[PDB]
Ligand binder design. Structure first.
Ligand code: ATP
Ligand code: CL
Ligand code: CL
Ligand code: K
Ligand code: K
Ligand code: K
Ligand code: MG
Length: 378
């Protein structure tokens, strides 16, 4: 093609291409190495990625996200029914299949999850093509290891709809392991633990690898734990702060909250590299600006319980895999949230000082491995 590797995440998607013995994680039009898995519909246009997320605060009802939580599932599924209660967009039942319903150009329209995901994939495909200056057709698309046949089929379909020839659908943890060359033959079997804390989900997977063959020994985690929850803790903290300083509660102003959240998410990223971050919002509420700051220590305390809780699934995964900590040959960090220093400390401490594989940007590791595999299969 060359063939590309695409990591379709619940919050962000990433595309990479292997060329000249090296993987290139491709930046988008805005120079971002990952793209929001968002799609929006307006009176005049369909927006995807950065353009869609950049307007979610003003168009919550027609801005779709979390299609990954619906893909391949039935409308009557317990989790689907539960998730619906939290989404600002409508999810309808079409013969037992869930579809997101939105307004586009003044008319009501509905899309299957795979159609929404195909839109995101199309964006990733175009991002790769702009970089390569060539048409991209072949691709390896990844999915959470626990995905069933239906979810895998629907994901492949999303690719096909986008004009991609899906060479293979592979597990995210396996892609991560491949990124670090853990698939190479070294004689005996090796146990690898993948600690994946993304934007909306937490996945711990223990893989056993031998002769280039992967076996998913166990999986654990929380489908509703991720970076967004950390942003939430910060949002609540600042709503309280604004209330103290201005005797005004911004909680019911959906837009103000979303704008504060965006500022929090950015502040959070800064706290992974610096011990303090500044938040400066204009016209947050009733023309009142919100200029303040937060320390790394403060950020850690606001999320202490959530951070510490990530170790429970690690213990469970080990137990289910019938392995002691000492039997894990490698620990691979995946997901943007694993860039948080406190998370790395907790995991490393749990593993008695064992070093973590974190040289590859965690939020790019899956796409990196998928790109390598795509090359191999091409
Ligand atoms: N430097 C950073 N420090 C802390 N968090 C970060 C950093 N960079 C990105 N993140 C967070 O990582 C999350 C995105 O991670 P990633 O791109 O792995 O998500 P994803 O694959 O869509 O998630 P999931 O697999 O849970 O669906 C967001 O919550 C983002 O705020
Ligand atoms: Cl773009
Ligand atoms: Cl600690
Ligand atoms: K992703
Ligand atoms: K994840
Ligand atoms: K997941
Ligand atoms: Mg992910």
């Amino acid at each position: 093609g060359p063939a590309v590797g695409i990591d379709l995440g619940t919050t962000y998607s990433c595309v990479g291409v292997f060329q000249h013995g090296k993987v290139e994680i491709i930046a988008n039009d805005q120079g971002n190495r990952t793209t929001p898995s968002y799609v929006a519909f307006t009176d005049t246009e369909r927006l995807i990625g950065d353009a869609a997320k950049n307007q979610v605060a003003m168009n919550p009802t027609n801005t779709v996200f979390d299609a990954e939580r619906l893909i391949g599932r039935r409308f009557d599924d317990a989790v689907v029914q539960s998730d619906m209660k939290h989404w600002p967009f409508m999810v309808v039942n079409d013969a037992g299949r869930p579809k997101v319903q939105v307004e586009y150009k003044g008319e009501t329209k509905s899309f299957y999850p795979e159609e929404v995901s195909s839109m995101v994939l199309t964006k990733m495909k175009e991002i790769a093509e702009a970089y390569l200056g060539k048409t991209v057709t072949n691709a390896v698309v990844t999915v959470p290891a626990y995905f069933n046949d239906s979810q895998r089929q629907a994901t492949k379909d999303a690719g096909t709809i986008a004009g991609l020839n899906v060479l293979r659908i592979i597990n995210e943890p396996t892609a991560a392991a491949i990124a670090y060359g853990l698939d190479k033959k070294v004689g005996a079997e090796r146990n690898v633990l993948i600690f994946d804390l993304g934007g909306g989900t937490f996945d711990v997977s223990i893989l056993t690898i031998e002769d280039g063959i992967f076996e998913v020994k166990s999986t654990a985690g929380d489908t509703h734990l991720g970076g967004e929850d950390f942003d939430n803790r910060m949002v609540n903290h600042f709503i309280a702060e604004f209330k103290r300083k201005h005797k005004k509660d911004i909680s019911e102003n959906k837009r103000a909250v979303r704008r504060l959240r965006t500022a929090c998410e950015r502040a959070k990223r800064t706290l992974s590299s610096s011990t303090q971050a500044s938040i400066e919002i204009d016209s947050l509420y009733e023309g009142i600006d919100f200029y303040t700051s937060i320390t790394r220590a403060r950020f850690e305390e606001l999320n202490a319980d959530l951070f510490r809780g990530t170790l429970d699934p690690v213990e469970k995964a080990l137990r289910d895999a019938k392995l002691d900590k000492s039997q894990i040959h490698d620990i691979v960090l995946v997901g943007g949230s694993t860039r948080i220093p406190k998370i790395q400390k907790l995991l490393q401490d749990f593993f008695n000082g064992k070093e973590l594989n974190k040289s590859i940007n965690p939020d790019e590791a899956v796409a990196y491995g998928a790109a390598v595999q795509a090359a191999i299969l091409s």
